[PDB]
Design a protein around this nucleic acid. Structure first.
Lengths: 494, 494
DNA sequence: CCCAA
DNA sequence: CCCAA
């Protein structure tokens, strides 16, 4: 069923930020499964407890981009998220028009693994044919980015996209207003912004932007929207300017604005991908298959020189995730002679760029990690860099590797982890049970601060300690008790 | 008195966006004078009326920057602004520590004209000596911009800057919490963002950033802050990185972040101003005084070629307001032979860049505006461009010029002005009394929409129609009646 | 002096 | 095929 798959996607698969295709932003030890729709129904049915503050804060997870710029993913508190997901499920007949939006490529869709939101799920076949069909006969390409699609989207504009702005103003119940209310409750009862990473906020953004897509489609524009990025194909240059103008009016109707720095008009034919993508693939040592596995095994010189050229392209161009693309090109065609060289190169690049840290888990088995403790020092230096740069993705993945592979962590970097206080990193540290007293001191400071949003920012740590009977429930409601009684575990075993 | 000057600055001078030094963002026909502190006290004392919505929306005024990027200035509704200014005045002893912040250059200060916030009020003497003293012995200059100092500043962080974050969390009355509440009431009871242009929000931003400045000052950093832009002078490069890191932690303490695109580290000695500033002044035809007025009168070739070079510099460099700087260099040294050439050049540049539109008022007397109606067509084409580009500064200044100088406006562009619906432009159109029925239809649509924020977005138009007895008061409170009874006029005569 | 932050 | 939006 579409409805049941939507419910299980919202809670069991796309609650945590898990929208990436190949490697996740979060280590795989964190999983939102065993959090079923029945449990969320029981949470939403709970009315006990008193909150001094209105709304709920969320666990914040800082993941670096390719330019080391932090992006704040969020894990919503399960009470507010359960209510929001239940409301989205209950009115899915009125919401599912976002599925039949041909212009939006990244939208809800029934996937095999159980998700609804997967970025870049479509294959290169249909992708290539689609951009060649859209770009045919047109000599201008328009790239326009919404400035604040996650950070300043208007929750009160959720009705305005559904029934119209004027009709929603006269009408002030409808499901869109309740969706607005629950989306506000998801983040501290704040009217602006949505948590990045869950599919509920992606559904809300699709609902808001579907009216803009419909208005642009009714004017005859050929365009594709990936989340917030619009790519339009225009026969003439005034058509590009008119698309930009009409998109500006349609975004300003819902209190949104184009990123004036990011919008650009290029001459077709450009490239189907970015230019660095073709530069990398045309220089890839693994670009041709041989159908025998011994032939397509890369040597040391090939991979080392290709990664050096990738660093050259990242410095010179820097138009995207060049290093991650090249590493994913060469990481699966390695032989056992060259594992140490590529692994040390990945360690250096991952110290410089934390987004390359998860690739260390690809070759984490072949590398003799005991050795002469040099790898322990390198991993702890990576942990120091992650604590200094305040990035949660690299620290979480490195801590996952150290816990799984029994790499020892010094006390000095544990002090830096507590000073940073990333919720997922502290969840991993609590799951190791070595550092119980420091986690206890941290959560005691959070409790004695008596701020409800401070507890909400570490609800996952508090629930992981409560579920293992290491700490009482910080809240006075029954949501944590309901989740513990039905065996909800966000750090499950295999 | 400092307190009385603060009150009269907040209400009579710096209510409207009037922080610019030479030419204002708003035409001079708009003035916030005759809105005295006694009147605001009477407004804040009023408790009658009922609002379905919480908070007040504000008049939005889109002013272009040098790159034609819109910046949204705001005129706060006089009830919320009166309460906010009264609360800022009543606790000025606890607020006035922002005056004694040596690192912040643009801060409240007792000025001769009655304002407290004037950008770049200090003379070139003290400016030049200050950047030469700060840059001496240091070889690195750090430019770091706060990303959302106006658009995502946290109102609940107003107590956190005053008494500390932890103490404000335990404390949950104090004046900072009430200041937070009134600042929220200024913009639709929204916890994020401040209206740009009034000095109350500048005071709030100074309060929030003063703790960051104190923390950076206590670590021995030599730095200067202009609004949101930090410029630090460092002996070594790690000192620059450590300043960037500590500023990141101090901003993240109050839910602020650096603009990672804008931050840069340059090598001292650079230039005291920007590089294009010295390029313009070293090529300025008026750069040397002669002490006789006939000698320093620029010819046609001099000004035309200097403006052509200014357009060349704006295209090639584009690092700032190059065209406005060069125009202000040459606009006051013109002779009567060259008025037509420079005025036509300004008309072309002002069509392309609306921020140059106010300079048309410098030579608006010498130009024979009747002529053969060509200037009427040029002004109406400028009005068409302002309606299409959705800019309020250029449209407001052009409408002010047309009303003052009796330039006729066609009905076709009046349709575009109503379609744009800028509040200040419609205030000017209502003050001309020619277009009464169209303004009546517009305000009838706003009234029949029954949205309180929609009335708040055009409160200035509604009050200008109410004060001239052309329309009844849209609100049910006594604020408009109090302002009318004491003769408050935001469009006063000379 | 003449901009902007 | 292998990224990101």
């Amino acid at each position: 069923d579409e409805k049941r798959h939507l419910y299980e996607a919202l809670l069991r698969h796309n609650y945590f930020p898990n929208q990436k295709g190949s490697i996740s932003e979060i280590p795989p030890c964190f999983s939102s499964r065993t959090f079923t729709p029945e449990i969320a129904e029981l949470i939403s049915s709970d009315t006990s407890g008193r909150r001094s503050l209105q709304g709920y804060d969320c666990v914040e997870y800082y993941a670096t981009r390719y330019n080391n710029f932090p992006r704040t993913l969020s894990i919503i508190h399960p009470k507010a998220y359960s209510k929001l997901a239940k409301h989205i499920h209950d009115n899915w007949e009125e919401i599912r028009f976002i599925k039949e939006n041909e212009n939006s490529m990244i939208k809800p869709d029934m996937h095999a693994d159980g998700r609804i939101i997967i970025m870049n799920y479509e294959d290169a076949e249909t992708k290539t044919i689609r951009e060649l069909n859209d770009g045919f006969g047109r000599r201008f390409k328009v790239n326009a980015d919404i400035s604040g699609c996650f950070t300043n989207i208007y929750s009160h504009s959720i009705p305005w996209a559904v029934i119209g702005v004027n009709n929603a103003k006269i009408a002030l119940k409808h499901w869109s207003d309740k969706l607005d209310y629950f989306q506000r409750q998801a983040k501290r009862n704040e009217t602006h912004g949505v948590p990045i990473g869950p599919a509920t906020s992606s559904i809300v953004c699709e609902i808001i932007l579907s009216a803009v897509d419909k208005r642009l489609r009714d004017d005859g524009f050929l365009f594709r929207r990936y989340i917030d990025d619009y790519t339009c194909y225009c026969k003439t240059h005034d058509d590009a300017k008119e698309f930009l103008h009409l998109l500006g009016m349609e975004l300003s109707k819902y209190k949104l604005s184009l990123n004036l720095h990011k919008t650009k008009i290029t001459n077709l034919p450009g490239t189907l991908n970015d230019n660095w993508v073709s530069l990398l693939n045309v220089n890839s040592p693994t670009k041709k298959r041989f159908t025998d596995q011994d032939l397509n095994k890369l040597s040391s010189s090939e991979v080392i020189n290709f990664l050096d050229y990738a660093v050259q392209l990242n410095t010179q161009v820097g138009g995207g995730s060049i290093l991650k693309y090249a590493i994913s090109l060469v990481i699966n065609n390695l032989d056992e002679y060259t594992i140490t060289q590529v692994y040390d190169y990945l360690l250096n690049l991952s110290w410089h760029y934390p987004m390359l840290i998860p690739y260390l888990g690809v070759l984490i088995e072949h590398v003799y990690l005991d050795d002469g403790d040099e790898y322990k020092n390198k991993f702890n230096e990576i942990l120091s860099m992650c604590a200094e740069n305040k990035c949660s993705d690299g620290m979480a993945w490195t801590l996952y590797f150290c816990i799984k592979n029994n790499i020892d962590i010094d006390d000095d970097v544990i002090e830096k982890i507590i000073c940073f206080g990333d919720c997922l990193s502290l969840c991993l540290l609590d799951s190791s049970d070595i550092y119980e007293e420091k986690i206890n001191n941290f959560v005691s400071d959070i409790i004695k601060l008596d701020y409800e949003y401070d507890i909400d920012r570490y609800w996952l740590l508090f629930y992981q300690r409560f579920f293992k009977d290491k700490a009482p429930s910080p809240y006075n409601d029954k949501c944590f008790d309901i989740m513990k009684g039905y065996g909800v575990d966000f750090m499950p075993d295999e």
